[PDB]
Every structure is written in structure tokens, then in C-alpha cells.
Amino acid sequence: MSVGFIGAGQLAFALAKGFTAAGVLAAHKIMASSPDMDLATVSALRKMGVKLTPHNKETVQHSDVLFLAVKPHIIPFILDEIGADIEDRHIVVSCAAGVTISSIEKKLSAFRPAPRVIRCMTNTPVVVREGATVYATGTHAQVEDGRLMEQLLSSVGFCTEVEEDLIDAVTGLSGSGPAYAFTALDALADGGVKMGLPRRLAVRLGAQALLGAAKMLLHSEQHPGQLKDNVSSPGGATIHALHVLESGGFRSLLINAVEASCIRTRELQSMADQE
Amino acid sequence: NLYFQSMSVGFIGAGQLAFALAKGFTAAGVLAAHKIMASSPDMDLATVSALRKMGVKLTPHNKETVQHSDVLFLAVKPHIIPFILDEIGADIEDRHIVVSCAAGVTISSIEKKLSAFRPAPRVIRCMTNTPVVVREGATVYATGTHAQVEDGRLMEQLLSSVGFCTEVEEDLIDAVTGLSGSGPAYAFTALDALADGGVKMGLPRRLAVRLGAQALLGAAKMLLHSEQHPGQLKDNVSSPGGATIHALHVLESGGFRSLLINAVEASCIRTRELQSMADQE
Amino acid sequence: LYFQSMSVGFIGAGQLAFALAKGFTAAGVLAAHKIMASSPDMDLATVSALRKMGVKLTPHNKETVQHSDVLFLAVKPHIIPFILDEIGADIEDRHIVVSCAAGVTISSIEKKLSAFRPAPRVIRCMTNTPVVVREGATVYATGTHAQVEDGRLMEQLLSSVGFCTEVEEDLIDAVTGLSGSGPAYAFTALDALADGGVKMGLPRRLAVRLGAQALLGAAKMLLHSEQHPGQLKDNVSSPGGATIHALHVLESGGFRSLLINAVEASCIRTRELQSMADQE
Amino acid sequence: MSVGFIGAGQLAFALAKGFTAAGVLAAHKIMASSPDMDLATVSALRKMGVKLTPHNKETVQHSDVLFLAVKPHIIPFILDEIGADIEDRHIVVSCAAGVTISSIEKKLSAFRPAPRVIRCMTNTPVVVREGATVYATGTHAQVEDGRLMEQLLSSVGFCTEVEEDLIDAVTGLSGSGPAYAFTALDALADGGVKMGLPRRLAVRLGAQALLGAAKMLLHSEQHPGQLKDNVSSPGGATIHALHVLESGGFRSLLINAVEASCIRTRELQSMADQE
Amino acid sequence: MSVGFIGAGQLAFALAKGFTAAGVLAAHKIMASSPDMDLATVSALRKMGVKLTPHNKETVQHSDVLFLAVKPHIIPFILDEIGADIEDRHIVVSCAAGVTISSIEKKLSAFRPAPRVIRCMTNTPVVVREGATVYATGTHAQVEDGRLMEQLLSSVGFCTEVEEDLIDAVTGLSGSGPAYAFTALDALADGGVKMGLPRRLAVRLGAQALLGAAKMLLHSEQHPGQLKDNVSSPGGATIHALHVLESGGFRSLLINAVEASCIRTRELQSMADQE
Ligand SMILES: NC(=O)C1=CN([C@@H]2O[C@H](COP(=O)(O)OP(=O)(O)OC[C@H]3O[C@@H](n4cnc5c(N)ncnc54)[C@H](O)[C@@H]3O)[C@@H](O)[C@H]2O)C=CC1
Ligand SMILES: NC(=O)C1=CN([C@@H]2O[C@H](COP(=O)(O)OP(=O)(O)OC[C@H]3O[C@@H](n4cnc5c(N)ncnc54)[C@H](O)[C@@H]3O)[C@@H](O)[C@H]2O)C=CC1
Ligand SMILES: NC(=O)C1=CN([C@@H]2O[C@H](COP(=O)(O)OP(=O)(O)OC[C@H]3O[C@@H](n4cnc5c(N)ncnc54)[C@H](O)[C@@H]3O)[C@@H](O)[C@H]2O)C=CC1
Ligand SMILES: NC(=O)C1=CN([C@@H]2O[C@H](COP(=O)(O)OP(=O)(O)OC[C@H]3O[C@@H](n4cnc5c(N)ncnc54)[C@H](O)[C@@H]3O)[C@@H](O)[C@H]2O)C=CC1
Ligand SMILES: NC(=O)C1=CN([C@@H]2O[C@H](COP(=O)(O)OP(=O)(O)OC[C@H]3O[C@@H](n4cnc5c(N)ncnc54)[C@H](O)[C@@H]3O)[C@@H](O)[C@H]2O)C=CC1
């Protein structure tokens, strides 16, 4: 099976890294393309054995499954450029935030009737095979196409099919989510350092606690509030810390965040659609 | 692996921590369940029924656990430790490794109590967390005055089977308690609230819970395997003008970073305060 | 359930004495005429109420102690010392003394009473006014000399007007902050919620009724469910819906921390008051 | 009398469980329909004894009283599905938040001329027979229809007739109301645990306190301020706790919540009334 | 001239880097010592040509000027260990935060009368020869000693003699100062990225603006408020941004910071002195 990436940045490197680390794709059967063939993501991809090229045309003619891995606003430019080269064998998987199946199918249908389009939202932890991924199938996506997508992306993390009208919300939760965790971990490390731990130890312990707590949840039947109960003993240290999180409106900040990321994703797509 | 060949473990107290550690210990295969004994006064309890299903030997007699164990974990609340040490103290023999898990409780307080019986108790203090139950714990430990060199080697091997383990000087353990001991509760509050956000934006609760937990899992895993500063990694995720940099701004406008600093601090300070009040009495 | 030869007496004839007596008679386990209350303000509003029930009223605490087998101390906490000095020589071996006072410890009660006769039988309880509708939340702790049959009797009596359970005494100040003061948080919340309903177009009477019915049913759901309150809150909030929007404005205000602050302030104040009674 | 539910989720389970606990209705005189059968609520209603079917038409033909228990945006889809199947004998009770009698009649009136519609607002504590219900009768609902609906819903809690223009306000007060109570109970338990109580005992005592206070109010002639006065003695623990609530603006948060819920209810019906 | 560093961490590397970059000391005439002879600061120092060693004894016997570059609490341990090796040729320059001349002279005078002690406060930008440095001379510091110190440290940044009772305040301002600037620069970069700049460009421009504004001030006669006036035109963009800094209490946060750093430095030295 032949894979290609339009655009070779953070997202394309993470995906090729996980795919090849999962063992489901050889690196030499993967090609990516970028105009700036001297990006540091281009270097990492070439060290990894991926075929690199500046011409978007060679990538499409190489691959069956084609990931669009450029920024949202470049997508119209990308699609006008390769639209004429989309054979019937292709599955076009769009990764860009907010870009709708409708808009991709409209641009590509001007060239070939019935382009096969899958929209996915992912995140950078696919690079360690722990990404969170949802996808939606376009009008002309065959049933097997959605099964190939799910098999492929389940090798690098969690995957499930969703209705397209959830994906902007997913983008704000698990698309932006790693950036919230990274911010939280830097602060928790700061807390550790304040109380006397060396930086390196504080980072390791915070990340390890974040990891174990999430895994606990994923493997537990129970509610996040219930697992929290089990950690905090009456009068003890944890319940005291939880009180200071509550007094600052900790929960509402996280809600504000997911909301802000989602709304901004919708807002960007209105300006894309208006234009 | 001969460290675990004939080794017997006991837990004084059979609650959340005993079950988490026994659950990870048995799931790791380092110990068979029947080689483990847990004791508690309220036998018919929530966690003591899980431990019996695993195959752990249970008993209401703290002394039976002492007679059974090579390594004896103290899995009771901190204020019970002196009450427990007075009880089984005359039973701790030279062959024992006493491992205190209680938050705050110093190696000094345990050694002072136990040395009024046999002169050289081998005491190790640890701080761990519940994710050892899925073998992803965060554990540190400090060896006491009489803890032999191999004693720390065995303790590290035992607790590394259920997660990260490293030795520390004792005076850090209270700050570790505020960071990784209380850590999981911070993550569960965060995950609950991310899901509320997901739900507010139109996601089913089940999907929002799965997705936020997977997102925290993957991000923490990325950090542990990366050679790079948590700031660089967030820089990689936020593209110019994008959804993510917008969401990071509302986190900054609420003082998100400082709330987690307050939290680690409040936990560490409460841990010290509880131990200074126990030291008074 | 009816304990024939059980005479009950109340020192103090106010809010709590009225609430306990109304619950006890409504439950039918005590006829009103086998109950006696005493107060110096025989022209109080709750004294009027208890006499309409048929409860035997009297101004003399000695008359209450001599009538009673179980004796409720339902006076302000600073009054408990003076009361125990007035009646302590009238205490007999047959009495079970139940103190209702916030924060006043069993130790303090026994030290005062044992100056008069050894081995007084003391139980400390924390309750709340909803016993008046038989939905109280009560805990109790037995003293040094209470017989095991005394706590079982107190528990039987008090279970008939709400939830009742034995606790260790050192939990009672925190229970005071949770369920003793707790009805007052509910009343403040129901007044506010009704205000919200009036703001959005509801008549005041309707808003009060619906608000109270919603708190009552949610509480009943939790008591009869196995599940976490968070889990029941997940069940009521649908994606993007009206409820998750409201929960967000609650979270932005630190709603949860305010109720932790409240329980904490009530408990600390309770300890503080006793800790300076112990100084006097 | 036969009862049907279009949509077999949280509300249908709550009403079915309450009606049969009340004994007004035999489980097997209840029928519910849902496309997504693998739902948790379908498994719960099955064991109750309710008849389950994927076809909304079978529910309509079974029912004398037909509850509309789908998400508010599904309502227009549903009324077009079974509109031809509504007969003269039906009483159509809409349980959807925000959806007006006007919009329901307009859809249904295109088929049979005189649809008997009732709008109701309820909440999940019907499942323990302590719900709070209001209802408005539509244009063709006869006097006997309102009486029958009142009788049915009074068996699972409080029920009264309102003008329809109140029901959006009711939704924010008593419809969303249980969720405010669950948040408060969880936080009240956290405070109990902070001060030394076991979680189980603190959950139990907080819920019992809210239950007794609410019942006290419902059985009282008195303003909630007066009851509050009765609990707080001079200098005492309660009046100190009420000060820290007042200092956080506790009352305004609850007003904010009711208002935010009511606004959202109106906003969604504006979106429906445009689409 | 012979220099030695007790402790080879961030501070010792920065100083040796600037000194050798200034051209006033050859790297091979510099020796440092550390127990953890495998620190990454140890590696940088060895790549640089400094003599490394684990024994604190060899450093003292190598150097004339001896910097104490360990953490404050290690200083008593350090001084008890080498006190007996302090010849009369040595100048002991203590860099540790908060540690007083008094306490160093007391420990060292137990071995040799009249130890020559200079207390300095510095910061990490000495590594690019732009540090801010103050020093105070001890009781037995000869006049030339203070002149050797000032000449040495003026080659790697600003230097001036102060009374010792200012140094804790200096520690909070220019000792901790670089950490405030680094925090500010990360946030300004975030602001740039929010408004559409690539990360790399936003960091470069912020740092360049921070640098030019400081240099402007250092070379200007005028008051920081006056230079601010000259930047903001009536109604323009700058004065708008300055208003949002004022509304959040920007200035007071910076005052809080310097204060917090200073008080904590005093507080640590009381516990050192008490112990
Ligand atoms: N970084 C993240 O956290 C994730 C990013 N995404 C999405 O993936 C897309 C890119 O993500 P990043 O990898 O952060 O982008 P990036 O900014 O790292 O680099 C994107 C690549 O596209 C290349 N490119 C630009 N114009 C091109 C053209 N005309 N033809 C071919 N290649 C071109 C750029 O040179 C660069 O190599 C965005 O739409 C983003 O929403 C989604 C999931 C996670
Ligand atoms: N749960 C957590 O998240 C962690 C807890 N810890 C520490 O572990 C200890 C207990 O942790 P949890 O298990 O959370 O408490 P827990 O209360 O779930 O278990 C306590 C156990 O001690 C038993 N116990 C009480 N008195 C006893 C006695 N006299 N003899 C024997 N057993 C007795 C209780 O019956 C109960 O089984 C505490 O000191 C806590 O600080 C430390 C790390 C993680
Ligand atoms: N009111 C409440 O919500 C609850 C009350 N309590 C406790 O119950 C006790 C009383 O509470 P309330 O009944 O609300 O007080 P209250 O002030 O309504 O009535 C107190 C009674 O004590 C009587 N009294 C004063 N001096 C007396 C004396 N020397 N001899 C006999 N009677 C005397 C007064 O006349 C008054 O009738 C307090 O200790 C309080 O902590 C505990 C739980 C809830
Ligand atoms: N959950 C609550 O707390 C309360 C809910 N409500 C209202 O009740 C309605 C539903 O409430 P929930 O039951 O919580 O929603 P829910 O999502 O639990 O159940 C919705 C049901 O509709 C079914 N459904 C979806 N499309 C359908 C279709 N085309 N034909 C037939 N059935 C279909 C789904 O399978 C699901 O079972 C909403 O409009 C809400 O406003 C009002 C009072 C309280
Ligand atoms: N990093 C900064 O921003 C500045 C630090 N300082 C001061 O300089 C001192 C250290 O600063 P950092 O370089 O941040 O320390 P650091 O933590 O980078 O490393 C200090 C060095 O001391 C070594 N060391 C520990 N015990 C030792 C011993 N017994 N004998 C010899 N070496 C030993 C450590 O192994 C490490 O190499 C502190 O007192 C600090 O206040 C002052 C100016 C700026």
C-alpha cells in the first residue's frame, strides 16, 4: 500500500513516524512533498527513509492513500493544483483543522466526478502511537475506505468514525488537548521546583502522574469523579490541593479552552467558506 | 529475578493503596497472590473483597501479617502509624523490611518507635500513587539508617514493576507527595472538565471522556519520550492564528499555570503540617 | 414501633425542641403528653407551638429532669454549663442525657455532671431542623458510661425522624458544618434559584415550588442511586444543551469552592467556640 | 391506556420507570422506539418490560398518549416521519426543551386537521416519583386532555398547568435544576471530606440535608429567608458559613445559571425556527 | 592569574564562558570542581578547556581567586571542608544567593585569621558578557582586592561595588530578572503567534525589541516614562496596548516579583543563620 503526504511538517512527520513504528508501512513506500525542502521536519523525514520531493504532483502519482497535511488556508491552493491528477484509486484524507468534506469535494469534483474523501482530526501523540483520532466519510467514500482508514489510524492510537459535525468540537478537545497537557505539565513541574524538587525530576513525575491517571481512567469503568474520590482521604493533602484548584475556577478554564478552540475553528471555516 | 523467588509481602491495612499495589504486583507477575497477605480490622470492606478475589490471603490480625512478610508495607492512614507501630513493634524482627507508604511520616518517627524493641529496624519510606494499579505509578523512596545496600536494590526492583521508581533523599518526599502522589486527582479533575467542555461543544459524554483522557495520555507519553522542553512541544502544536493558540490564551487569562502551582504547594504544605502536628503529639 | 414507658424531656423549648417534638409525635413513637419541655421565656413563639401539640410545658428545669428518662439539652452551647450546674444534683441513674448543642463535647458534659453523681450516661448528637418533617440528618456518639442499649435506643428514636447513624465524636464538628448548617445553604440556594426564575418570567410562588421540588427530587435520586453525583449530572446534561451551558456559568464562578468554603467555615467556627468554652 | 415514547433514552427511561413504580401503567402497555438499539437505556427499558421497536410507526399505532422524547432538533424529522400516522384519538405530549406547540401543530396539521398537542417540561427525578412538571395545552387539546395529562404526571411528582410562554423559564429552573443540585452535592461532600468525614458518609449527609431542607420548604408557609433565620443562631457556625457564601456571590451564580439555561433554550428554538 | 570554581553548574559555566570570551582568562588557567563529574555543565566546561576535578581540595590549591559556585545551603559544608587550605593569597568570592560575608568569615576565621572575602551577586547573562553584577568587600578585603574584582567582572557585564545590605534586593531585581524577561518573551511570542506570526519570527522580534528598548534606556539620559511617551502616538496602537497592561496591574506584578524574590532570599538566610 502506497501513502503520500501533501506538506511535510509536524503532522506529516508524526504520522509517518507512528505508521512506520507501528510496522504497517515501510518508510520507502511513503512519499511526502514540501516547497521548503529544507525544513527541519523535512530533515527528520529524510533521516527516517521517507521519499521527499518539492512537487506536489509526484506525491499524488505515487500514492493510493493521500493525506493532505498543509495548513487549512493552503488546502484550496493544494486542491486546485492536483485536482486534475486525482485518479479513481485515490483516497484523499484531509487532516486540516475545520476544512469541510463539502468544500474538498466541490473543488475536486470540478475535475473528476465522485472524489473519495475522508476527513480526519488527529493530534501529535500519534508519533508515540497514542494519538486520539476521529474521521468522517465523504459522500463517495466506499464502505471499505472507512475500514482502511480506521485500521490504519488505530495502529497509532485511538480511532473511531464520527459524524462530520462533531469534528470541530473534537478539534478543540483532543486536537488542542496536548497543548493543554503540556501547559499543565510545565506548571506542575514549576510547583515541584517551588517545593524543592530538581526540574528534571519534577517534569518526569508530573508527566508520569498525568499518564497513569489517564490510563487508569481509560481502563476503569468508573467516573472521573469517583477515581478522584479514591485518591483523596479525609482531611488529607490531596483534598486540600483540590480546594485551591476549585477556588480559582480550574474546571471552567478547561471548559473555556475547549470552547475557544472549537469556536475559533468554526470561525476560520466561515471565512474560508465566505471566501 | 531471584529477588522475587521466595519473597513474601504483607500490607498493614487493606484499602486503596494495598489493593492498587497488590493489583499491579500480581498483574506484573513479580509475586503470586497467595504469597501476599493483607490485614484490616473492617474485613468485610470494599477493597478487602477485591483482594480476596485476586487470591491474596486476608486476616484481621496485623501480627499474622508481620509473621508472614519479608517486606511489610504500612498501608494505613498516617495518624494510625504510631498506633500500629506500638502494636506490632515487638514483632518486627531483623529479617523484616518495613516500608512506610503513609504520606508525611518520617523515617525518624518509625525508627524511633521500632528501635525501642529491636535496635536496628530496616525502614524504607516511599511515596507512590494509585496508577500502580495499571502499572503506571510514580514512586520515589528513601532508605533509612539501617537499610542495607541490597534493601534499596530489592525495593527499586519491586516498585519498578508497577511504574517509574527512583531513589531520593528523604527531604524531597513531601514535595513529591504534592506533585505525583496527589497528581492523579488533579488529572481526574482536569479530565472531568475537559469532557464538560467537549459536551458543551456538542460531543457525547462517552466520546468526550475517551478523547480527553487519550489526549492527556498521549501528551504525557510524548513528553517522557522527548528530549525537549514542554514549551517547545506546545509551540509545535499551536500554529499561527489557530484554534490552539486561542485556547491557550483563555487558559493564561485565568491563571491556569498558577492554579497548579498553588495545588502542588497546598498538598506539600498540608503534608508537612500534618507531620509537624503528629511530631508534637 | 412505640416505647410505652419512655418519658422524654427537653431543656430549652425553641427551634430544635419544637422540631424534635413534632417529628417524634408525627412518627407516632411518642405521644405528646409523655413529652415535657422547659424554658424561662414562657412567652416564646415555639413555646406556643409545643403547647398546641399537647407537650407539657414548665418553666422549671428541675420539673423536666424529674419527669424524664431521656433528657434533651436543646439550649445554646454557652448555656450548657449553667444548665448542668442547675440540674446535675437532680440527675439519677435512670437518665440518658442527650446533648444537642453545637460543638459541646462529651468530656465537658461528663466533667460537670460527675461532680454530682459518678457515671452519668451521656450521648452527643448533631441533628438538623428537617426532623420536623421526618427528613433529618442525625449523627450521635456515646459517652463513657452510656450502655450499649442506650445508643441502640437513641438510634431507634432518632431514626424515626430521619437518617441516623453512630459516629466517633471527633467527626461531629465536621457533620455540624455539613448537615447541621446544611439546610441553611439549601434555603439560600432556593431563594436565589427562585430569583432566577422570577428574572426569566416565572411567578414567585411557582418558582419557589419548582425550585424546591427540583432540589428534593435530585437529592432523592442520589440517595436511591448507586452512582456518583457527577454521573447523574452527566445523565442530565445533553450535548450543547441548556443544562451544560448553565453548569459552565456555575463553574466560572467557583460555585463548588464556595460550598467547600462554607462547610469549612462552619466546622472551624464550631471548633473555635468549643475551644474557648474549654478556656472558660 | 397505552403509552408510547418516540426515542428511548434518558427521559423515556425516567418516565417509564416512574409510571410503573407508580403503578399507573403496566410495563408492557409502554412501547418505546429508537434506531440506535445498542444504547444503555434500551437495555434498561428491555429488562423493565417495555416493548422496544426500531420503527416509530409501531409506537404511534400502539399509543393513546405519545411522548416525543427525542432531541429538540430531531422533532421536525420525527413529525414528518409519523405525521400521517397521528389519528384523532392521539394525545401528543412533547417533552423536548424549547420546542413550541406552534411548530408541532404546523407540521402535524398538514396531515390530520386537529392534532391534540401538549407541551410539557419535566426532569429526571420522575424516576423516583419526585419530578417537577409543567404543561401547556395546545389549540385542539380538549379539557379532558389536560386533566388526563395532569393525572398521569402527578403520579411521578409535582405537576401543574402553565401558560406556554413560561416553559423556557421552567426549563432553566427545574429542568436543569437537578444538575445544579448534583454539582452542589458533590462540592458539599468535598467540604465534608476536607473537614475529616469519609466520602460515603459525607455524600449521604449532604443529600439528606438538601432533601430535608427542600421538603421543609415545600411543607412550610414561610419565606426561605425566614427558615434560614431559624437555623442560624447569633455568632454561630451557620451564620459564619453564610457569610462566606455571600462573599463569593453564591446567589448570583444560581441566578446566572437559571438565566443561562433559559437563554440557551430560547436560542436553540430561534435556530430551529430559522432552519 | 589563577581562577577556580567550587561547584561547576550554571553559574560556573556562565562565568568561565564570559571570562574566556572576554579574553581576560585562558581556559587552562581556570579549574572547576564538582562531585558529579558527569553533569552536562561539566561536559560543556571540559569541551571549553577548563580543568575539571572532583576534589574541592585541588581547586583551592590551584587558584588565587576562588569563586564559590554551589547552592547556598552547600556553602557551610564547602567552607568546613577547605577552610584549612585557604592560604593568605586567596580571594574567596561567594556567589551564593543570600549568604552573608559575616557567616563566611566566621567559618573561615576558625582556620586562618583574616580570610579575604568578596560577596557578589551576578546573573546568567554573563555568558554573553551582558551580566549585571554587584559586589561587597569583607572586613579583610584589601583595596586592590575590590579593584581586581571589579576589573574582572566588568569584562562580562555591568559591575559596581555596593553595601552588603543591598545585595538581597539586587538578587530579586537583576539576579532573578532574567527569569522575568524569559517569561515575558515567551508570552510576547505567544501574542505574536496568536495574531499570525510564525513562532521563530515572533521570538526573534520580541527578544530584539526587549534588547533595543533596554539599550535605549541605558544610553538615554531620560526616564523610562519619557521613552514610553515617545513611542505612543495619540489614539494609536501602542497606547491601546498599554491600557490593557495597566488594567491587569502589569506594573504591580513586577513589583510583587522583585519583592517576593528578595523576601525569600532574606528568609532562606534566617534559617541558615538560625541553623
Ligand atoms: N501540529 C498539530 O498539533 C496538528 C496539526 N494538524 C493539522 O495539520 C496541518 C498542518 O499541521 P502542521 O503539521 O502543524 O503544519 P506545519 O506548519 O508543521 O507544516 C505544514 C507543511 O506544509 C508545507 N506546505 C506549505 N505550503 C505547501 C504547498 N503549497 N504544497 C505542499 N506543502 C506545503 C509547509 O512547508 C510545511 O512543511 C494543519 O491543517 C493543522 O490543522 C492536525 C492535527 C495536529
Ligand atoms: N490512596 C492514595 O491515593 C495513596 C495513599 N497513600 C497513603 O497510604 C495510606 C492509606 O492509603 P489509602 O489506602 O488511600 O487509605 P484507605 O483508608 O483506603 O485504607 C486504609 C486501610 O487501613 C485500614 N486500617 C485502619 N486502622 C487499621 C489498623 N489499626 N490495623 C490495620 N489496618 C487498619 C483501614 O481499615 C483501611 O483498610 C495513607 O497513609 C495514605 O496517605 C499514599 C500514596 C497513594
Ligand atoms: N436551630 C438549628 O437549626 C439546630 C440547633 N442545634 C443546637 O440546638 C441548640 C438550640 O438550638 P435552637 O433550638 O435553634 O435555639 P433557640 O434559641 O431556638 O431556643 C433555645 C432555647 O433555650 C432556652 N433557654 C435559654 N436559657 C435557658 C435556661 N437557662 N434553661 C432552660 N432553657 C433555656 C431559650 O428560652 C430557647 O427557648 C443549640 O445548642 C444549637 O446548636 C443543632 C442543630 C440544628
Ligand atoms: N435528560 C433530561 O434531564 C431531560 C430531558 N428532557 C428532554 O427530553 C428529550 C430527550 O431527553 P434525553 O432522553 O436525555 O435524550 P437521550 O439522547 O437520552 O435520548 C434521546 C433518544 O432519541 C433517540 N432517537 C434519535 N433519533 C431518533 C429518531 N429519528 N427516531 C426515534 N428515536 C430517535 C435516540 O436513540 C435516544 O435514545 C430532549 O429534548 C430534552 O430536552 C427534558 C427534561 C429532562
Ligand atoms: N543560575 C543562576 O541564575 C545564578 C545562580 N547563582 C548562585 O550560584 C549558585 C549555583 O548557581 P547554579 O549554578 O544555578 O547551581 P547549579 O545547581 O547549576 O550547580 C551547582 C554546582 O555545585 C555542585 N556541587 C554540589 N555540591 C558540591 C560540593 N560539595 N562540592 C563542589 N561542588 C558541589 C553541583 O554538583 C553543581 O555542579 C547558587 O548559590 C545560586 O544562588 C547566582 C547568580 C545566577
XYZ file of C-alpha atoms in Angstrom, chain A residues 10 71-72 97 123-134 157-158 160 162 165-167 169-199 201-219 223-225 227-228 230-242 244-268, chain B residues 16 77 103 129-140 163-164 166 168 171-173 175-198 200-205 207-225 229-248 250-274:
232
model
C 4.700 18.486 12.303
C -2.425 24.397 6.895
C -6.174 24.985 6.394
C -8.485 21.833 11.017
C -3.039 15.038 17.169
C 0.687 14.976 17.504
C 0.921 12.000 20.004
C 0.417 9.681 17.015
C 4.215 9.974 16.971
C 4.337 7.712 20.059
C 1.328 5.675 18.832
C -1.023 7.251 21.421
C -2.992 9.685 19.288
C -6.718 10.338 19.505
C -8.283 10.230 16.051
C -11.764 10.615 14.625
C -3.754 5.497 18.712
C -7.463 5.590 19.366
C -13.412 5.947 15.636
C -17.918 10.225 13.834
C -20.496 17.918 12.595
C -18.593 16.716 15.696
C -15.094 17.216 14.280
C -15.655 20.044 18.723
C -13.178 17.143 18.670
C -10.533 19.585 17.355
C -10.948 21.686 20.487
C -10.776 18.724 22.860
C -8.201 16.225 21.607
C -6.758 18.240 18.697
C -5.711 21.117 21.004
C -5.677 18.870 24.103
C -1.952 18.008 24.018
C -1.174 21.726 24.257
C -3.283 21.969 27.426
C -1.494 18.975 28.936
C 1.924 20.422 28.002
C 0.950 23.707 29.683
C -0.300 21.816 32.742
C 2.885 19.752 32.967
C 5.117 22.804 32.774
C 3.153 24.398 35.635
C 3.106 21.251 37.808
C 6.853 20.993 37.293
C 7.121 24.610 38.441
C 5.129 23.678 41.530
C 7.504 20.809 42.230
C 10.535 23.054 41.775
C 8.988 25.631 44.119
C 8.625 22.975 46.835
C 12.222 21.754 46.411
C 12.451 19.138 43.574
C 15.034 19.377 40.785
C 13.474 20.369 37.453
C 12.654 15.002 38.469
C 9.614 17.277 38.701
C 8.935 17.001 34.938
C 9.271 13.207 34.953
C 6.965 12.740 37.941
C 4.309 15.105 36.673
C 4.242 13.503 33.231
C 4.200 10.062 34.846
C 1.302 11.052 37.088
C -0.601 12.553 34.126
C -0.007 9.365 32.150
C -1.027 6.912 34.863
C -4.143 8.864 35.781
C -5.316 8.904 32.165
C -4.558 5.228 31.691
C -6.400 4.456 34.939
C -9.447 6.250 33.581
C -9.270 4.595 30.150
C -9.137 1.134 31.778
C -16.440 8.135 36.510
C -13.536 10.621 36.778
C -15.132 11.992 39.961
C -11.414 7.940 40.816
C -10.776 11.360 42.371
C -10.455 7.231 45.839
C -7.337 9.398 45.784
C -8.301 11.989 48.446
C -8.533 10.807 52.079
C -10.486 12.829 54.677
C -8.513 15.859 55.886
C -5.506 14.854 53.760
C -3.202 16.620 51.337
C -4.993 15.906 48.059
C -8.379 17.303 49.118
C -6.574 20.465 50.278
C -4.933 20.913 46.888
C -8.236 20.229 45.129
C -7.284 25.560 45.770
C -7.943 24.304 42.214
C -11.674 24.869 42.772
C -11.236 28.340 44.249
C -9.529 29.521 41.078
C -12.176 28.064 38.773
C -9.832 25.360 37.417
C -12.621 23.400 35.725
C -14.072 26.449 33.994
C -10.711 27.353 32.461
C -10.557 23.927 30.783
C -14.128 24.429 29.542
C -13.222 27.925 28.310
C -10.283 26.394 26.432
C -12.112 23.612 24.571
C -14.828 26.143 23.735
C -12.364 28.752 22.489
C -10.540 26.231 20.285
C -13.830 24.974 18.840
C -15.337 28.409 18.124
C -12.136 29.635 16.502
C -12.157 26.520 14.274
C -15.741 27.305 13.212
C -14.894 30.969 12.700
C -11.911 30.192 10.468
C -6.999 1.672 48.172
C -3.566 6.441 57.271
C 2.072 10.488 53.478
C 0.119 6.759 43.661
C -2.868 4.735 42.553
C -1.797 4.317 38.850
C 0.428 1.393 40.001
C -2.873 -0.490 39.674
C -2.413 -0.175 35.887
C 1.362 -0.435 36.427
C 1.996 3.214 35.555
C 2.775 4.508 39.022
C 5.173 7.258 40.020
C 7.207 6.125 43.055
C 10.154 7.545 44.989
C 5.853 2.086 37.109
C 8.672 4.574 37.430
C 13.863 6.192 41.686
C 15.543 10.275 46.571
C 13.562 15.690 52.473
C 12.022 15.687 48.954
C 9.255 13.175 49.655
C 7.113 17.734 47.628
C 6.779 14.562 45.595
C 3.538 13.919 47.514
C 2.096 17.210 46.299
C 3.226 16.547 42.712
C 2.763 12.878 41.835
C 1.070 11.476 44.965
C -1.807 13.951 44.614
C -1.095 14.225 40.871
C -3.788 11.785 39.708
C -6.565 13.752 41.441
C -5.509 16.883 39.528
C -5.684 14.909 36.258
C -9.136 13.494 37.111
C -10.497 16.990 37.814
C -8.962 18.180 34.543
C -10.323 15.210 32.563
C -13.776 15.692 34.053
C -13.761 19.352 32.995
C -12.318 18.825 29.515
C -15.216 16.422 28.997
C -17.688 19.085 30.155
C -16.152 21.377 27.559
C -16.389 18.658 24.940
C -20.721 21.848 25.836
C -19.472 21.942 22.233
C -21.725 19.032 21.146
C -19.760 15.790 21.886
C -21.404 12.778 23.554
C -20.098 12.464 27.106
C -16.727 10.141 23.466
C -15.546 13.339 25.170
C -14.233 11.366 28.188
C -12.382 8.860 25.969
C -10.893 11.626 23.828
C -9.631 13.902 26.600
C -8.049 11.014 28.519
C -6.397 9.733 25.341
C -5.162 13.302 24.717
C -3.604 13.605 28.200
C -2.165 10.093 27.901
C -0.565 10.788 24.539
C 0.775 14.193 25.575
C 2.378 12.867 28.765
C 3.796 9.969 26.786
C 5.243 12.353 24.203
C 6.975 14.361 26.944
C 8.525 11.308 28.595
C 9.995 10.151 25.237
C 11.184 21.313 26.775
C 7.403 21.166 27.401
C 7.311 24.661 25.913
C 8.754 23.566 22.570
C 6.183 20.808 22.328
C 3.287 23.240 22.893
C 4.930 25.539 20.337
C 4.797 22.639 17.864
C 1.051 22.223 18.370
C -0.124 25.854 18.099
C 0.004 27.122 14.535
C -0.228 30.906 13.954
C -3.729 32.390 14.457
C -5.057 28.896 15.069
C -7.563 27.254 17.350
C -4.962 26.059 19.827
C -3.129 29.337 20.459
C -6.553 30.907 21.011
C -7.401 28.270 23.639
C -4.017 28.706 25.340
C -8.003 31.766 27.748
C -6.015 29.364 29.953
C -3.452 32.132 30.575
C -6.186 34.679 31.269
C -7.498 32.558 34.106
C -4.052 31.955 35.652
C -4.215 28.227 34.806
C -0.478 27.730 35.446
C -0.617 29.292 38.896
C -3.564 27.165 39.990
C -1.486 24.023 39.518
C 1.406 25.639 41.363
C -0.993 26.511 44.200
C -2.163 22.909 44.171
C 1.231 21.204 44.444
C 2.077 23.760 47.108
C -1.089 23.265 49.134
C -0.613 19.493 49.130
C 3.061 19.635 50.137
C 2.310 22.185 52.876
C -0.558 20.092 54.249
C 1.719 17.015 54.246
C 4.331 18.877 56.315
C 1.699 20.419 58.614
C 0.194 17.003 59.385
